[PDB]
Amino acid sequence: QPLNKYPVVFVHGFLGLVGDNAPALYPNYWGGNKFKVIEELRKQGYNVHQASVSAFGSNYDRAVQLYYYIKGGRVDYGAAHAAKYGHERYGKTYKGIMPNWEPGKKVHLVGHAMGGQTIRLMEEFLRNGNKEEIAYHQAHGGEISPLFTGGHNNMVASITTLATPHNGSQAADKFGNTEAVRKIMFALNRFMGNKYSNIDLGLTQWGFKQLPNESYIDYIKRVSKSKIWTSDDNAAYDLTLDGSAKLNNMTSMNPNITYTTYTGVSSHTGPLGYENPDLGTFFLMDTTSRIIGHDAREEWRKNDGVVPVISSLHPSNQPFVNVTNNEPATRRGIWQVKPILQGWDHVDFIGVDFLDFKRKGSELANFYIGIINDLLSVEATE
Amino acid sequence: QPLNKYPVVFVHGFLGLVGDNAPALYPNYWGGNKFKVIEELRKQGYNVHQASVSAFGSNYDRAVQLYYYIKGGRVDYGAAHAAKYGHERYGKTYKGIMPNWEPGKKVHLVGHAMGGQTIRLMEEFLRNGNKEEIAYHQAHGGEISPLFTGGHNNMVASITTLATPHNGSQAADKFGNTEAVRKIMFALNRFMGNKYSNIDLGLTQWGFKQLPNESYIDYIKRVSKSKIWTSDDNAAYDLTLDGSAKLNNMTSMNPNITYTTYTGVSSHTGPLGYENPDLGTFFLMDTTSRIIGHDAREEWRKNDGVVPVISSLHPSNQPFVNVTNNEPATRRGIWQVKPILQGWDHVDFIGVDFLDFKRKGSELANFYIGIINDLLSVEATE
Ligand SMILES: CCCCCCCCCCC/C=C\CCCCC(=O)O
Ligand SMILES: CCCCCCCCCCC/C=C\CCCCC(=O)O
Ligand SMILES: CCCCCCCCCCCC(=O)O
Ligand SMILES: CCCCCCCCCCCC(=O)O
Ligand SMILES: CCCCCCCC(=O)O
Ligand SMILES: CCCCCCCC(=O)O
Ligand SMILES: CCCCCCCC(=O)O
Ligand SMILES: CCCCCCCC(=O)O
Ligand SMILES: CCCCCC(=O)O
Ligand SMILES: CCCCCC(=O)O
Ligand SMILES: CCCCCC(=O)O
Ligand SMILES: CCCCCC(=O)O
Ligand SMILES: [Ca+2]
Ligand SMILES: [Ca+2]
Ligand SMILES: [Cl-]
Ligand SMILES: [Cl-]
Ligand SMILES: [Cl-]
Ligand SMILES: [Cl-]
Ligand SMILES: [Mg+2]
Ligand SMILES: [Zn+2]
Ligand SMILES: [Zn+2]
């Protein structure tokens, strides 16, 4: 039936909420009002989905959730990980989009921003498992998630990243991950865990769900003991240069996977060689753009608003090849880096910059269809 | 010892709330965060004020309120007017900014947008009074406001208008004044009349104040009988082409007053000769800009977002002269029309377009100081 033989799963980044989990008023993540990615691609006969994973959690937590989003079942972050970081072992349970997902039944993975890192980690787990969990289950018995065992291949056809901070962002190091702003984020998470909340910001495994008969006062007191407040097992840490380097250091290339990256630039050079945001950079990224743009290291300056070009092109010191827009992007095992999209800020990739009339719905439609064409090419050249 | 011998009163337009009457979070009307008109002009030694008058009411109601804001005392809309339109005769009471205001002790009046019409009407009443009120008091005795008597000259030195719809706006005829949107506006007014509200949207004379012991249910029922719902005595009517023409038809030039207008353009011509909003037009005016810009009549197309250029230049039936930026704007009795400000949308005049980095604080400071320079020269050439 579907034009694509392998389902396409779109994976949101940091802060992203999709589907039923999005607030009463909130942007449509995948395409804004410019091009409704899921609805329009389905209309054209493609089998596509938008994953729903933790908005504030670590790449680790998100990758586990991605696995269960696809496969179905109760999220298991692993006994060793849970014990190390101090959060629940078990999380939400997903219906599962492909309950029969197993070697042979592949999926295409496309990540926006942090979603691009989450996708890399999950594939890491399928192929190589998680050594701390393998060791823990060796030593202590129990059950180990099949996600953590290793030896699961032929499950992902492709990894495509849009404005992914593969090498981290100074906007995390110098803003997102500062103590002051972690506190803001964690307070939001505490609040949206209240007993009248219908939205899950992705840190409930840390205790941020108020019980039906618990007072707010008691809730505050209970969750102030959580390790979340000082942990590095969260998104803000993972998005720093160091946090992202750690992920780069534990990933490897899969020779069967087609890897491709897209990157935008939305800054311009000033007289001193610093980068400032273009008019048209979605305004909430003006300061973050300036922070990145004023880096001491010149090659870390050009940026899409919140991710420097050098972070998005490809993980540092993984194999890559610069590719043209026209040619087949059908090489396996190597990051195919697409030419930089001029004027595209971080959120232009998902169409939510409603203030930017230069970035048209029809342009965004062509961009997404071009990704699907590449994915079809991957399938055709198996 | 202020530098200006006559106080300057700045008069906000439609929707404008100032000072104590502005919501918890709300822009600073005169200058935004770009150039704090009142505070900065005072720092430079000028005696300036921002009037507070009805945000949603008619030019008539607003002109009465402006009078009392300056002079002090209990607002009196006039017995005849109250009876004709079906609202209270008496309104709020103002401390008064110049309790000694009288022939000889003059004020400079500067109006943004609708404020420019309000200022014209008030001066009309001072000079020629209000015949229906004079007649009514003749017939029925009682008191008549000094505002409605006529014969008050030498009270206003100058009328300066910024982006004033002297000839109305299609955005009112085709949107603002439609039944569906009057209902929205009147509902907001009903709500902000609730017994916990600290902000006055300027329609309380129509019944929109909930009593301390009145239920919301009873309030709804009581104010649905008000004539506001079907009256033309409101801002939305007055801003239409017809509503503004009516004001033009009953006002006249005062040969002792210095008149000056400023106008902005923030649209550009397309291939069919229609006008579309520039990038940089504050986004909430995008649709209104397009409605104006697609007018059948070509000369009614160019616009600042919500006011077409031909509306802002001068009242269509009144004498004007095009003036250069460098001419002393000291001719009396004739609309001195200042060269159009290219790239200035309707709200760039008051500095609130926080999304538009092309329009800088230092530019806005020069613009306001230039108005004060003109006002000084009016005083010097008496
Ligand atoms: C609240 C603090 C913001 C800190 C910013 C840190 C750096 C961010 C780099 C990229 C993060 C990952 C995905 C970005 C997703 C964008 C989604 C959205 O705008 O709704
Ligand atoms: C809610 C409906 C708005 C419809 C627009 C009608 C036409 C408006 C023409 C000029 C309006 C007069 C004063 C404009 C004052 C602007 C103040 C502000 O934006 O904070
Ligand atoms: C739009 C932001 C509103 C500002 C509220 C500040 C509250 C700070 C921390 C609140 C934590 C909580 O409510 O559990
Ligand atoms: C800005 C929030 C929008 C909510 C729209 C619903 C309101 C309908 C009319 C309300 C009238 C009233 O509450 O008196
Ligand atoms: C035309 C859309 C109406 C504005 C409400 C949407 C609020 C939001 O952006 O979250
Ligand atoms: C402004 C708060 C309104 C709802 C509080 C619910 C009371 C409870 O927790 O038992
Ligand atoms: C909950 C606060 C209500 C804000 C009213 C805004 C008035 C205006 O638009 O002029
Ligand atoms: C809806 C939240 C607050 C309503 C207050 C009611 C007061 C009253 O009507 O006596
Ligand atoms: C009530 C609104 C919560 C917004 C959560 C977010 O920014 O992802
Ligand atoms: C135009 C701004 C309205 C916001 C009103 C408030 O939240 O107090
Ligand atoms: C009349 C009691 C409720 C009105 C106040 C409010 O809606 O906040
Ligand atoms: C002046 C306010 C009108 C809102 C029009 C819009 O958002 O399309
Ligand atoms: Ca943009
Ligand atoms: Ca503007
Ligand atoms: Cl499996
Ligand atoms: Cl929840
Ligand atoms: Cl008087
Ligand atoms: Cl009130
Ligand atoms: Mg919900
Ligand atoms: Zn974790
Ligand atoms: Zn009235």
Side-chain angles (χ1 to χ4, degrees):
Chain A
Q1 203 71 64
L3 261 23
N4 52 307
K5 108 197 193 82
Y6 303 134
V8 191
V9 178
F10 292 89
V11 183
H12 67 261
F14 178 43
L15 259 35
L17 299 173
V18 302
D20 296 321
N21 192 47
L25 307 175
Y26 183 86
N28 169 241
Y29 190 94
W30 287 104
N33 292 309
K34 295 187 177 185
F35 173 70
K36 300 199 109 71
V37 171
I38 300 308
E39 170 190 353
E40 290 306 315
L41 259 25
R42 280 171 177 171
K43 266 151 65 181
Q44 295 179 26
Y46 301 108
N47 180 21
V48 304
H49 300 93
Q50 54 185 358
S52 188
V53 303
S54 173
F56 285 83
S58 56
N59 276 310
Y60 182 106
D61 291 1
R62 288 165 46 110
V64 174
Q65 292 167 15
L66 211 210
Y67 173 78
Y68 288 92
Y69 168 79
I70 299 173
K71 182 56 171 172
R74 182 159 70 137
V75 163
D76 171 5
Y77 296 114
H81 181 277
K84 182 181 200 296
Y85 288 105
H87 74 234
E88 293 292 339
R89 171 178 179 184
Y90 297 109
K92 73 166 284 183
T93 123
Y94 284 92
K95 216 270 255 171
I97 230 66
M98 285 173 69
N100 302 304
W101 190 37
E102 68 187 347
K105 278 82 164 302
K106 299 192 199 190
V107 76
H108 300 283
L109 295 175
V110 2
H112 173 243
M114 193 185 183
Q117 289 172 312
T118 296
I119 278 169
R120 283 166 56 214
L121 219 201
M122 178 186 79
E123 190 279 334
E124 168 65 10
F125 288 157
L126 285 175
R127 177 161 48 83
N128 301 303
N130 172 340
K131 296 182 297 288
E132 300 90 328
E133 297 303 335
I134 294 159
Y136 182 107
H137 158 100
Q138 251 304 119
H140 305 292
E143 292 152 55
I144 181 171
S145 175
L147 176 64
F148 295 138
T149 267
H152 311 280
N153 301 303
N154 254 73
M155 280 175 76
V156 357
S158 59
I159 292 176
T160 308
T161 78
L162 322 185
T164 291
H166 284 111
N167 310 126
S169 168
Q170 306 98 116
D173 288 48
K174 293 174 188 188
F175 164 65
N177 189 55
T178 62
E179 287 304 312
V181 352
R182 290 191 312 121
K183 284 163 190 168
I184 294 175
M185 291 183 5
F186 298 151
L188 213 212
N189 274 265
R190 177 178 58 217
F191 181 65
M192 294 307 298
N194 79 242
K195 58 176 79 168
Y196 288 83
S197 173
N198 294 296
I199 87 160
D200 178 354
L201 260 44
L203 296 183
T204 61
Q205 64 272 30
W206 294 98
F208 288 135
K209 187 58 178 293
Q210 183 184 200
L211 302 186
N213 301 322
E214 179 179 40
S215 67
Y216 206 83
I217 297 192
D218 290 305
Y219 174 47
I220 298 177
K221 178 142 75 83
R222 174 176 60 83
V223 301
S224 77
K225 297 195 291 274
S226 178
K227 295 221 288 172
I228 181 60
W229 303 94
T230 51
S231 179
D232 284 338
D233 185 40
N234 65 261
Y237 174 77
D238 277 355
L239 289 164
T240 62
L241 298 219
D242 287 348
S244 292
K246 278 184 185 165
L247 169 69
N248 293 336
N249 289 332
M250 71 163 94
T251 59
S252 58
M253 304 310 285
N254 180 146
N256 292 142
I257 293 182
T258 301
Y259 291 79
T260 140
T261 72
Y262 292 88
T263 297
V265 56
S266 185
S267 62
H268 58 267
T269 322
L272 284 318
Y274 294 122
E275 297 284 308
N276 286 300
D278 298 347
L279 272 28
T281 304
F282 189 70
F283 71 103
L284 285 183
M285 288 184 296
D286 278 344
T287 306
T288 56
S289 198
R290 286 167 177 114
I291 289 168
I292 295 173
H294 293 251
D295 203 272
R297 301 150 293 169
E298 165 169 11
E299 72 280 6
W300 279 81
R301 294 186 181 150
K302 292 176 200 309
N303 69 85
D304 72 1
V306 274
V307 2
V309 165
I310 195 167
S311 181
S312 176
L313 254 19
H314 56 83
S316 44
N317 312 318
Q318 295 183 347
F320 67 101
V321 58
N322 302 325
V323 129
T324 210
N325 264 302
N326 311 113
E327 72 181 297
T330 213
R331 291 190 64 188
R332 267 95 168 134
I334 187 174
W335 289 104
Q336 299 170 119
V337 5
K338 237 90 206 222
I340 293 170
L341 286 173
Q342 296 301 316
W344 286 50
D345 69 37
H346 195 72
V347 301
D348 293 319
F349 283 89
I350 55 173
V352 301
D353 183 351
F354 63 89
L355 268 352
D356 186 351
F357 189 63
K358 299 158 58 59
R359 300 275 66 83
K360 308 285 172 191
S362 49
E363 174 190 70
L364 195 57
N366 283 157
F367 171 79
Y368 276 88
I369 288 158
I371 297 176
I372 298 292
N373 289 336
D374 287 349
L375 263 29
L376 253 37
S377 282
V378 170
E379 295 182 3
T381 63
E382 261 179 347
Chain B
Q1 355 70 62
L3 263 24
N4 53 307
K5 146 183 82 175
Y6 303 135
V8 189
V9 176
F10 291 90
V11 184
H12 70 257
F14 178 45
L15 259 34
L17 300 171
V18 302
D20 315 79
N21 191 47
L25 279 352
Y26 185 83
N28 167 242
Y29 187 94
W30 288 103
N33 292 308
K34 296 189 178 181
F35 173 72
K36 304 224 172 262
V37 170
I38 298 306
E39 170 192 348
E40 287 304 318
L41 259 25
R42 280 169 179 173
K43 266 157 69 177
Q44 291 174 31
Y46 301 106
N47 179 22
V48 302
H49 295 97
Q50 55 184 358
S52 184
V53 304
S54 170
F56 287 82
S58 55
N59 275 312
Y60 181 105
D61 293 359
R62 286 164 49 110
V64 174
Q65 293 165 14
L66 211 212
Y67 173 80
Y68 287 91
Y69 168 79
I70 300 171
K71 180 56 168 177
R74 183 161 67 138
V75 163
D76 172 5
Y77 298 110
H81 181 277
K84 184 188 189 191
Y85 289 105
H87 74 236
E88 292 296 340
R89 174 176 176 185
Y90 297 110
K92 73 193 82 86
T93 122
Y94 284 93
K95 192 178 186 294
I97 232 64
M98 285 176 71
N100 302 303
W101 190 38
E102 67 185 348
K105 300 195 167 212
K106 296 193 200 188
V107 73
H108 300 282
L109 296 175
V110 4
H112 171 244
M114 194 184 182
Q117 289 171 316
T118 297
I119 279 167
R120 289 168 48 217
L121 220 201
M122 176 186 81
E123 187 281 330
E124 170 69 25
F125 286 159
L126 286 174
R127 170 164 44 96
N128 301 306
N130 173 343
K131 47 93 179 178
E132 328 195 53
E133 296 300 338
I134 295 159
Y136 181 107
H137 154 101
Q138 252 300 296
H140 305 290
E143 288 160 302
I144 180 169
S145 175
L147 174 65
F148 298 136
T149 268
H152 311 276
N153 267 262
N154 252 234
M155 278 179 75
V156 2
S158 58
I159 292 175
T160 137
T161 80
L162 323 188
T164 289
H166 284 111
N167 308 124
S169 168
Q170 306 97 121
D173 289 49
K174 294 180 193 172
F175 164 63
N177 192 53
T178 61
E179 290 300 312
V181 353
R182 290 191 309 119
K183 285 164 187 174
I184 293 172
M185 291 182 7
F186 299 151
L188 211 213
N189 276 266
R190 178 179 59 218
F191 182 66
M192 293 308 294
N194 79 243
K195 58 175 74 170
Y196 287 85
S197 172
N198 293 295
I199 88 159
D200 180 353
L201 262 43
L203 295 183
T204 65
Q205 66 270 30
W206 293 99
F208 289 134
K209 186 61 215 169
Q210 182 186 199
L211 305 178
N213 301 324
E214 178 184 39
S215 68
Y216 207 86
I217 296 199
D218 290 306
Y219 175 47
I220 296 177
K221 211 258 280 278
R222 173 194 56 132
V223 300
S224 75
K225 298 161 158 82
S226 176
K227 293 229 294 179
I228 181 60
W229 301 96
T230 50
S231 175
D232 288 343
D233 185 43
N234 65 261
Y237 174 77
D238 278 355
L239 290 164
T240 58
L241 297 221
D242 285 349
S244 292
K246 275 191 190 156
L247 172 65
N248 292 337
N249 293 336
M250 65 151 298
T251 52
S252 57
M253 247 41 81
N254 175 158
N256 305 140
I257 293 182
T258 300
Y259 291 79
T260 141
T261 72
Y262 291 90
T263 297
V265 181
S266 186
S267 64
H268 59 266
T269 323
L272 284 317
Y274 292 123
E275 296 284 307
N276 285 302
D278 295 349
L279 274 33
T281 304
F282 190 70
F283 73 102
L284 283 183
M285 286 183 300
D286 278 346
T287 308
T288 57
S289 195
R290 285 167 181 113
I291 287 165
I292 296 171
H294 293 251
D295 203 273
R297 300 151 293 169
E298 165 174 3
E299 71 281 6
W300 277 81
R301 295 186 183 150
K302 290 196 138 289
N303 70 85
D304 71 1
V306 274
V307 183
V309 164
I310 70 294
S311 182
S312 176
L313 254 22
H314 56 84
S316 75
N317 63 160
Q318 302 183 356
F320 66 103
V321 58
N322 299 329
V323 133
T324 204
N325 266 126
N326 305 112
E327 286 178 68
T330 52
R331 293 192 63 186
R332 261 129 261 226
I334 188 174
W335 288 105
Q336 298 170 118
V337 6
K338 232 97 210 261
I340 290 171
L341 289 166
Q342 293 305 317
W344 286 45
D345 69 36
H346 194 73
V347 303
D348 293 318
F349 282 89
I350 54 175
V352 300
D353 180 351
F354 63 90
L355 266 354
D356 187 352
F357 324 108
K358 290 181 301 303
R359 299 276 68 80
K360 298 177 199 310
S362 53
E363 181 194 37
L364 194 57
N366 285 157
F367 169 82
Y368 277 91
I369 289 160
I371 297 174
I372 297 291
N373 289 337
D374 288 345
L375 263 29
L376 252 37
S377 81
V378 169
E379 296 183 359
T381 62
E382 262 178 347

